[PDB]
Structure formats: structure tokens, C-alpha cells
Write a protein that binds this ligand. Structure first.
Ligand SMILES: [Mg+2]
Ligand SMILES: [Mg+2]
Ligand SMILES: [Mg+2]
Ligand SMILES: [Mg+2]
Ligand SMILES: [Mg+2]
Ligand SMILES: [Mg+2]
Ligand SMILES: [Mg+2]
Ligand SMILES: [Mg+2]
Ligand SMILES: [Mg+2]
Ligand SMILES: [Mg+2]
Ligand SMILES: [Mg+2]
Ligand SMILES: [Mg+2]
Ligand SMILES: [Mg+2]
Ligand SMILES: [Mg+2]
Ligand SMILES: [Mg+2]
Ligand SMILES: [Mg+2]
Ligand SMILES: [Mg+2]
Ligand SMILES: [Mg+2]
Ligand SMILES: [Mg+2]
Ligand SMILES: [Mg+2]
Ligand SMILES: [Mg+2]
Ligand SMILES: [Mg+2]
Ligand SMILES: [Mg+2]
Ligand SMILES: [Mg+2]
Ligand SMILES: [Mg+2]
Ligand SMILES: [Mg+2]
Ligand SMILES: [Mg+2]
Ligand SMILES: [Mg+2]
Ligand SMILES: [Mg+2]
Ligand SMILES: [Mg+2]
Ligand SMILES: [Mg+2]
Ligand SMILES: [Mg+2]
Ligand SMILES: [Mg+2]
Ligand SMILES: [Mg+2]
Ligand SMILES: [Mg+2]
Ligand SMILES: [Mg+2]
Ligand SMILES: [Mg+2]
Ligand SMILES: [Mg+2]
Ligand SMILES: [Mg+2]
Ligand SMILES: [Mg+2]
Ligand SMILES: [Mg+2]
Ligand SMILES: [Mg+2]
Ligand SMILES: [Mg+2]
Ligand SMILES: [Mg+2]
Ligand SMILES: [Mg+2]
Ligand SMILES: [Mg+2]
Ligand SMILES: [Mg+2]
Ligand SMILES: [Mg+2]
Ligand SMILES: [Mg+2]
Ligand SMILES: [Mg+2]
Ligand SMILES: [Mg+2]
Ligand SMILES: [Mg+2]
Lengths: 119, 82
RNA sequence: GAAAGAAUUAAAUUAAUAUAAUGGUAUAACUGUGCGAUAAUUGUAACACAAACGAGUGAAACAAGUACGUAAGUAUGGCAUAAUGAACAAAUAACACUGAUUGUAAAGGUUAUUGAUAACGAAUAAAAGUUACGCUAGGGAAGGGUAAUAUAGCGAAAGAGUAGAUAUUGUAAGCUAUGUUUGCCACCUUCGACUCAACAUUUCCUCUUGGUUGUAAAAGCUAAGAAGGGUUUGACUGUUCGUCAAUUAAAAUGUUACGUGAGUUGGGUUAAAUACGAUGUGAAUCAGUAUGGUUCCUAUCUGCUGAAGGAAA
RNA sequence: AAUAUUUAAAAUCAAAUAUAUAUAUAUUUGUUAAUAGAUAAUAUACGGAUCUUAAUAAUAAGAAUUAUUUAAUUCCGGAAUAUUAUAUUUUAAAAUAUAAAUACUGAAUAUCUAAAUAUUAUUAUUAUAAUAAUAAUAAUAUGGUAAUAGAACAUUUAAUGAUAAUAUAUAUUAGUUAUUAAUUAAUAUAUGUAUUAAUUAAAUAGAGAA
RNA sequence: UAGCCUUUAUAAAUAAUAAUUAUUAUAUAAUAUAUUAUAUAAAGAAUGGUACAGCAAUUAAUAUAUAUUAGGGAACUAGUUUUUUAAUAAUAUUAAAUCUCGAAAUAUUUAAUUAUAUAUAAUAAAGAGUCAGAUUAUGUGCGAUAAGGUAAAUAAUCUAAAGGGAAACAGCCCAGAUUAAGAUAUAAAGUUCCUAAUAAAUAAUAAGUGAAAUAAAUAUUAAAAU
RNA sequence: AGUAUGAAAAUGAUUAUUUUAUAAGCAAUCAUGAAUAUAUUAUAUUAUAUUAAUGAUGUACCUUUUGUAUAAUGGGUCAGCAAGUAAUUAAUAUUAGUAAAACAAUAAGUUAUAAAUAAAUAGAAUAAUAUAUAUAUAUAAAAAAAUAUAUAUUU
């Protein structure tokens, strides 16, 4: 009411592009972690780096966090996500049950990917 | 193999839990680089802070002296005394 | 095939628990019964929980003695969580510690015990008011936000409108607008009159126009455009308001620190005096009544009214 | 082409992922706009300008609004090139690019380039030598109120204490040392001159804030 | 006083911080179905009752040409045709701060291992300041689903934080100034001019709607599925 | 309120250089032309100093506050003066002297040398490290709780 926190209700094209890149970067981090674990498993079994990378059979991670992060239904990749959920986040105190993801504190660091099926 | 991990985003607004996650990885100031022997423990610690770091796999590690040698720029001259 | 056992399974903790509520309880912690009345005993208590301190909570183990039990064992009050109070000063008993020249005393100490500081970590054994005659040191522990209220519109239309919800009208409920009202928060500690007014339009009059069994004419009601011009004298009252009288085309509503006190007034409302009615034992007090009653300023800047000089012409 | 709920990716349909190599299970995504309602008081307020494109028509414009995206999608190992700068010599135009898996701006961020301080290691030179000084390399760190802890400078006084007008002190101007301080030069005044350089001991020891 | 800060140190010191392994099951093998091994799937050792979900028990609500109970509605000498009120059964629907029969994520937390040692924890001697807090997000109590309101609960920042963006801006987005330099990669935000920096694709808008603070019910005109 | 000196500042008039009469805000910093001044290596196409062309950036300082350019406090300017000091004590830390002793040295006296108990006539290995011993509670005596002392040389 009194203070002027002039935060617009919708993002711009540049903001959307940056958000897309950030999502992609997190996806890349997850992918690299899994690949490193796979190569480590191969090297422990005896193979070397070259055919560890070229191995037809890729070893899946055995930790809960990595397995869940790799499941698309838990942490969908950027290209899998919907345009709505790329930029809008779920709020139960807002008309339409949505708010711009840029109104979340520290939104460039924290990650949101999934909202309720019917919201 | 090794995870080369770089502290990309800062910690000026990060909760103390994630801040400790990072500090326990050996990472310091923003832009710091560290190589970690790949294993599930470090993998999970990095997963929990995936949004503030960059990760890439490598065969071998580089000690800070080697990283410095690779970072040093090219002096465009050769000196002969007189 | 049948009796009598042992019981098993489902259900039950809704009854009962000394007492609130919560957790627990049938393997019962509930209930009945025999002994008993003993552990509702004594000297050390580790270690934990909780925790600023001071306090609080569970308790293994060693030693002394009890009651129950064939035995294994159980019992250091109550199925658990409330049922409480420091130190000082007094008082009673025991202990055999010290006995101010010595002896005994007196007195002190150790152990046990008693009385409550309910503002309940308890100032002292012991304590209420008033100041509009008041004083010092400090803090502020009309604007701003809100729109419950107020005002206004919109959607829908139950009902009036001799007939027909929609000429007019629109009663409970719905959606919004204003920030003029009464309140709410605590960022920020003069009401009326006189004079001069500037601004808005949510138009009172004046111009243009649509509707009106409910526009024959005249006078009207309702609505759209429209802010150019215009929009009151007097009696009562401190009054803004309000009731009247006489006028008017009309006697519209608001904003400007509810415009304007370095522009005037000081009638109301703000202290010192006094009296009345009430309250109080009293000082004195009152969103009571009445008479009287002390604030001033030569314009530096901005702004404005009107004059001049310098200048680039 | 006419009677014509609803505003949908649940269900169906279509593309993609992970298991599957003669096909299936699971997962991810794709279902409307414009206007009206609209709303006050010093002055119109996207910050302002201004922003919607159009043949003839020239080097040369056509959102600067909204919704998905690219810097070719694409996956979890591809090219598509009006680019612009080529031509033999061909004569309606003619050979070839870079540069596109990371367009551009952008901080006191990070790197590089140099400097200071502290510490952890390794070295070199010089004279608790297992030290001290200076320097070199790698790494980490250096915002700060209330507050804590180290170090140093200016002033004055006491102890020790040469030198001397070719000096000392003070003031102004211009230079030097990583500079609250001292120093060098010129000029001006006073003085045959230091409580001097340095080490200690002490303060009426540092003022835009009462 | 505790909590948060500072100086100096102590070792039979890593006790600190973070994550992983813990489990259940499948397949394929072995070994000796039971294991061991490999791969894979599952929100994955122990503790808990919030969201969600549900109507079980408790507390509340609705319905019935279905039943029990009571006064009992044209013939009448005890017994009806019934869109007769209330209570109890039956069936089907519903919700709740002090309701959880189901039940998350975060969370609490254990041993070992790994990483962080130019780093944590604990301990000893000694010195303070603080005990008026403020916004922004997410759950809430009160207020009216009001307040730049008030009261506490997790972050973060200001307090005590310069620098870039938000036009201007204590608290928002990014990033933490030892001193310079200015070549490179940039964060948030932007690239017609003011003002550093851009070229495109596919649709829609015609209302300057909108372009860095989205105003509602409703009304009109337009879009395709059978 | 001594004497002499006194280019100390605030303040006033005048002169010189430079800018200024189409431009708007803590009066300053940076960028950058131009005028002037000085310069005994300006060899210059030089250096330095002074000066509001012009451009960008820039919300005085303290106090007190959650928070101030704030229209919250204090200040017309300058010079001088203006605020953690003294004794008498206790605890801790560092160095220095001496050291199972130290300070005094006339006698005394204060710490340390033994822990404990409210106190009393009690007080530390029976041929070794707590399982022994001392004190306090309890005593046949132990056990139990808490502290403390013993593994050539006493701390
Ligand atoms: Mg009981
Ligand atoms: Mg119960
Ligand atoms: Mg504890
Ligand atoms: Mg305690
Ligand atoms: Mg009992
Ligand atoms: Mg005796
Ligand atoms: Mg005697
Ligand atoms: Mg006695
Ligand atoms: Mg009291
Ligand atoms: Mg109390
Ligand atoms: Mg208490
Ligand atoms: Mg009293
Ligand atoms: Mg009076
Ligand atoms: Mg009618
Ligand atoms: Mg009504
Ligand atoms: Mg009008
Ligand atoms: Mg007429
Ligand atoms: Mg007024
Ligand atoms: Mg008025
Ligand atoms: Mg005035
Ligand atoms: Mg008067
Ligand atoms: Mg009277
Ligand atoms: Mg009179
Ligand atoms: Mg689907
Ligand atoms: Mg306006
Ligand atoms: Mg830096
Ligand atoms: Mg510092
Ligand atoms: Mg820093
Ligand atoms: Mg002084
Ligand atoms: Mg002074
Ligand atoms: Mg100063
Ligand atoms: Mg002063
Ligand atoms: Mg304290
Ligand atoms: Mg449950
Ligand atoms: Mg609850
Ligand atoms: Mg560990
Ligand atoms: Mg408080
Ligand atoms: Mg508040
Ligand atoms: Mg901080
Ligand atoms: Mg403060
Ligand atoms: Mg800042
Ligand atoms: Mg902008
Ligand atoms: Mg700015
Ligand atoms: Mg507009
Ligand atoms: Mg001019
Ligand atoms: Mg001016
Ligand atoms: Mg205040
Ligand atoms: Mg400010
Ligand atoms: Mg002012
Ligand atoms: Mg002021
Ligand atoms: Mg003043
Ligand atoms: Mg004994």
C-alpha cells in the first residue's frame, strides 16, 4: 500500500530466456553427476575412460536423490516442462492460484519444477 | 575420474544449510574451482547444491600450481639483455 | 457319537481410574480376594533429562532393616503430568562440635521440625489521595495507511406502478468506485466569522438531446453532452449546520493543512478569580452551567503585484 | 450447410522420452480473443520522446504490444550459410570464406596484469644462524556500527646527547619518499643558536560537533 | 545470568560440518530354497502425525412412495388407501483448531566410510557490547481473507553493506570495496534516441489495448466439437 | 590589564589572470577544450600551476534511531580553552630477579609448602596407580558419593 516495490506481474522476454538457461544449467549439472558416477563404476570394474564413455550400457545411480532427480516425473527437464510452469508458480493466496516465478525470493538460485496436476 | 566443480552463483542470500553444504565441499569465493574424486558422497553433496555450482567430469585433476600455469597470460615479448 | 476340561479367536480401554484435560491401561495401571499395614523406612547417591542462576524430574549401584511370596522377586507412597514460597529473625527436640582466664554455664554450630512473603524470585515489622497554583530531566515508545462505516455506481429483479418487473420505481442478498463522514493503526506531538479566493464535476440555473399506458398543451419525472457565464438578504443562535421571513433562472456538492490568524477578529473552545448542580470525608473533580480574562515580528530566500537599470542588436 | 452443452490434454488424439531390436508398458507436453463496465480536485505522466507501415520508390522502413522460441532447431553424434573481400575469363549474372553447439552491453563479481599486509609451505642474498632483514613462487584472507585485540605518528616535559650563520627554527610556493609525517630547492624574519638524532619515563598529549 | 562476539593456549584430539551405506523387492548367476554376487526398481535404517486425503469412532448436516415409535386425517364396532411431525434403525451423500481409521516432502537423528585440515568441535585464563528491531517471501492467532496494524514460527537482507538492476528507492533481484590497472568471462537487468549494447522465426492485437505498480460481477461482438 | 615581535584565521576595500548576461539544485570529483603564469637541458610537437567553455556522476556533517537529504537534534565564522585521571586495595596475564622457597631483613608479618570439615584432640602407597591412602557422611571395618596424594629425584 505505502511502499513502492515496483515488481511487475509478468516477466520479459530476456528474463524468460535467462530462466530457461538456468533450468538447462541445472539439468546439465545433474547429467554430469550421473555420467561421472557411471564412469567411476566402469573404472572400478576395470574398464578405462575411453570405453567407459563409449559403453553401450550406462549405469544408473543408486542413491535416492539422484534417482528421483533423474525421474522426469519428479524433476522434469527444461524441454519437458510446460511454458506455464517455466514462469509461473503455485500460490494459494492469489487469484488464479498462480504467481510469477520472479516474485519468489532468490528465484534465480532456488528451483521449482512441478505444480499440482490440476493446478 | 574427477568432478571439476566451480562455484558459479554467490552465497549472499543462501540459507545456512546450503552454505554449509558448499563450505564442506572445499569451495570458497565465487568462481572457485575444485576437483573431487568421483564417489556417491560427493555426488550427493553436489546434487543438494546443484543450483549454485557448475560440474564437469575429467580424467585427471590439476593442482593449483598447474591451474595457475594454465591461467597465466601470454607476454608478447622476448627479452635480450644489453 | 457325547460329556467335562484346557482354553483359542473376534470385539472391547466407549465402563473404571481419588480429582480437570491429555497420553496410558484388559499382558490391565480397572475390579475381587488372603496376608499385611510393611517400602507413606536409614547413610552414600553415579549418570542422564530439563536448565541462566536458584530450583525441578527419572534413576542404576553399595550398605541397614522391614512386609508379602513356594519361588522368581516386588515395594524408598498413589497409571503419569498440578496440589506451592528463598534467605534474615524467632521457636522445639536431638548431636557432643566450639565453650573468649580456667570449670560449669550463657551463646553459637550441625541434624530434624513449625509458621507464607497470592504483585506468589518474596524492598520495610510498619503507608492513601489531589494540584485548572505547580516545578525539573526526558520521550512524544492536522498529515500518512485502511475502507468496517458513510457516499456512489453497476449486474440481477421480489414487489408497487388501475393493465405491464424495467415511464417512474428497485426493500434481503452480489460486484466494485471515492477517500468528503464516524471509526480503526500509531510512521509523523483551533470551530465559527471577515477578506480574497484558485481548482474539480458527482450540473442547482442557463444551451443541445433520448425516454415517459405513465410526454395532448403548460408544468413536470428520468437520463446523455456540457464547467462559458451565474449560483441571497434578514430574525435566533459562538456556531459550521438548522427553523423561519422575503427574494431568485438557481439559491449544487466538494478539494485547496475540514484553503486563508508572519491577512483582521477572539464570540465558542484551552490556565490563573468566583458561584451553582452533582461526586468525594477532604484536598479537589466534572467530553456540566455562568460572569471575566495577554501572545507578538521592521521580509533574507521562493512566489506574486508594479516599476527601472545592464545586455548580444 | 443447418437445430448447436463446453472454454477442456482428466478422458481421447498427436508429437517426444525410459525400458524394448516381429511390439508393448510407463512418463512429459499441446485446448481463445477485442471492446464496455473505468471513476476528482496545482499539470497530460509507459521515467520522457515516441512505438502498429505503404506499389510505383532510390545505399534504406514496416512494433519499440502480447504468447512460444532461436541464435537452426535437434538429442543425453548432423548439417541448411541473402554473409562480406576475389575470379580464370566467362561477355542474365557468375565460384571463396571467416562468424555462427559460447549474438551484444553489463558490477568495486571472477580471471589476467602489477602493488601492500597476515598466515601455511618452498627458495635465494646479507650479518633463539633451528634466528633477523630483504626478495621470489603457490595457496588462503583483508566491508563494517556496538565491541575486542595488535602497531605506529604529531605536541610537551625529565635522563643521556655531537654539530653550527656554508647552521637552526618558523612561514609560503614547487618537487621526493606508498605520504595524519618528514625531507629537498628558492624566498622572508629571528637567532652564534636545538632539551636536536636515537632509547627510555611521563603526561593539562591530537576537537566541526556538549 | 544464559544466548550471540574477542584475545591467548591445550593435547593418548577429528570428537565438528556435509553427503553415502543401512531397507523392501525383481531378474540373472553362482555358492551353500537360504544365502553370497552383480544389475535394476521403490521418496529407501529408527522417531513423528502437519499438508493432502477421509467420514471410521466423537462432534455436526441432508435425503428416502424403506422400516420401528407417538398423536393418529371421507365408511366406521378392533384395523387402511397416506405429496401427518419428531426420535431410532437401513441405505446414499457431506466437514472439524482443540477428529485422524490412510498419510507426504522438509525435519529430528545413529554407527562406519568418504570429503573439508591454510578447516571445524571441545576445554582453560581473561575482556565486552546487546536485552526498543525493520521489511520481503511462506504457514498462522487477533482484526473485517482491512492497514506502512499487531503477536509470535522457519530463511534472507538492512541493522553494521559500498557496487549493478528495480526511473527515484535502508529491507526486493545480483553481488560482498586491501590498492591500482582495464585485456578477457560474466551475474541480475537491458540493446530505436535520451543511454553502454540485436538480428531473426511462428501466431495474435487495431483497442495506443499495451509498452516496469494487470480493476470485479456483468454485457456485446467474434473463434470448433460433434 | 607586563614587554617586543607578529605574511595565524575569520572579516573589509582594491588590483591582476581566467570564466560568466539562453541557464536551474551540498558548489565537488572525473573527462576535456581554451586563456594566462613560471621554468639557467621548453631539444618541443615541452612540463607544471591558476581559471564555473563543455560532458558524465553526485540527496552536507554529527547525534539518535528499525529507519533521516529529511521539513527530527546541534552549529554565523575563525583563534584559544574543554572530557577515563589520582590514591588504598583484590583477581588475572607477560617479562625480570630469586626459587622449595619469595619479600623484608631489628622483631614481626604476608603468600607458597596438604587435602578436608560447621567444627573437634583427625590428616595421604602394610614390598605401588587406584583396586592403595587422607578427609567428610556410616562405622566392627569395609563397600558407596565427591575431592585430593604417592609410578636420579621432593612442588
Ligand atoms: Mg490414580
Ligand atoms: Mg482417557
Ligand atoms: Mg541437553
Ligand atoms: Mg543446574
Ligand atoms: Mg496401585
Ligand atoms: Mg567432647
Ligand atoms: Mg570462660
Ligand atoms: Mg544449644
Ligand atoms: Mg513484588
Ligand atoms: Mg514475579
Ligand atoms: Mg519461574
Ligand atoms: Mg507498600
Ligand atoms: Mg478553576
Ligand atoms: Mg406488479
Ligand atoms: Mg439492497
Ligand atoms: Mg457529465
Ligand atoms: Mg411540455
Ligand atoms: Mg481550516
Ligand atoms: Mg472552508
Ligand atoms: Mg506561517
Ligand atoms: Mg474568550
Ligand atoms: Mg455545590
Ligand atoms: Mg469587564
Ligand atoms: Mg496426459
Ligand atoms: Mg493525472
Ligand atoms: Mg575483487
Ligand atoms: Mg576490516
Ligand atoms: Mg572483502
Ligand atoms: Mg586536552
Ligand atoms: Mg579549534
Ligand atoms: Mg577533523
Ligand atoms: Mg563547539
Ligand atoms: Mg552476558
Ligand atoms: Mg496414523
Ligand atoms: Mg492441527
Ligand atoms: Mg564422522
Ligand atoms: Mg524486548
Ligand atoms: Mg510491523
Ligand atoms: Mg551480512
Ligand atoms: Mg542501532
Ligand atoms: Mg547498498
Ligand atoms: Mg529502464
Ligand atoms: Mg540509480
Ligand atoms: Mg497506455
Ligand atoms: Mg552565453
Ligand atoms: Mg539558480
Ligand atoms: Mg521514533
Ligand atoms: Mg534516503
Ligand atoms: Mg530546506
Ligand atoms: Mg537539519
Ligand atoms: Mg540552530
Ligand atoms: Mg574410610
Amino acid at each position: 500500500g505505502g511502499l513502492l516495490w515496483k515488481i511487475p506481474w509478468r516477466m520479459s522476454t530476456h528474463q524468460k530466456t535467462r530462466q530457461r538457461e538456468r533450468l538447462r544449467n541445472v539439468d546439465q549439472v545433474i547429467k554430469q553427476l550421473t555420467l561421472g558416477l557411471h564412469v567411476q563404476r566402469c573404472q572400478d570394474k576395470g574398464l578405462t575412460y575411453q570405453e567407459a564413455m563409449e559403453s553401450k550400457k550406462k549405469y544408473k545411480p543408486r542413491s535416492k536423490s539422484l534417482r528421483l532427480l533423474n525421474k522426469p516425473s519428479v524433476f522434469p527437464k527444461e524441454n519437458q516442462m510446460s511454458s506455464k510452469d517455466k514462469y509461473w508458480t503455485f500460490d494459494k493466496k492469489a487469484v488464479g492460484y498462480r504467481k510469477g516465478i520472479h516474485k519468489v525470493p532468490k528465484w534465480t538460485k532456488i528451483s521449482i519444477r512441478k505444480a499440482p496436476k490440476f493446478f | 575420474v574427477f568432478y571439476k566443480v566451480t562455484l558459479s552463483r554467490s552465497l549472499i542470500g543462501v540459507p545456512h544449510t546450503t552454505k554449509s553444504i558448499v563450505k564442506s565441499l572445499g569451495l570458497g569465493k565465487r568462481g572457485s574451482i575444485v576437483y573431487k574424486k568421483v564417489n556417491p558422497a560427493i555426488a550427493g553433496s553436489l546434487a543438494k547444491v546443484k543450483e549454485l555450482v557448475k560440474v564437469e567430469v575429467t580424467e585427471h585433476e590439476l593442482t593449483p600450481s598447474q591451474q595457475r600455469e594454465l591461467r597465466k597470460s601470454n607476454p608478447g615479448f622476448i627479452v635480450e639483455k644489453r
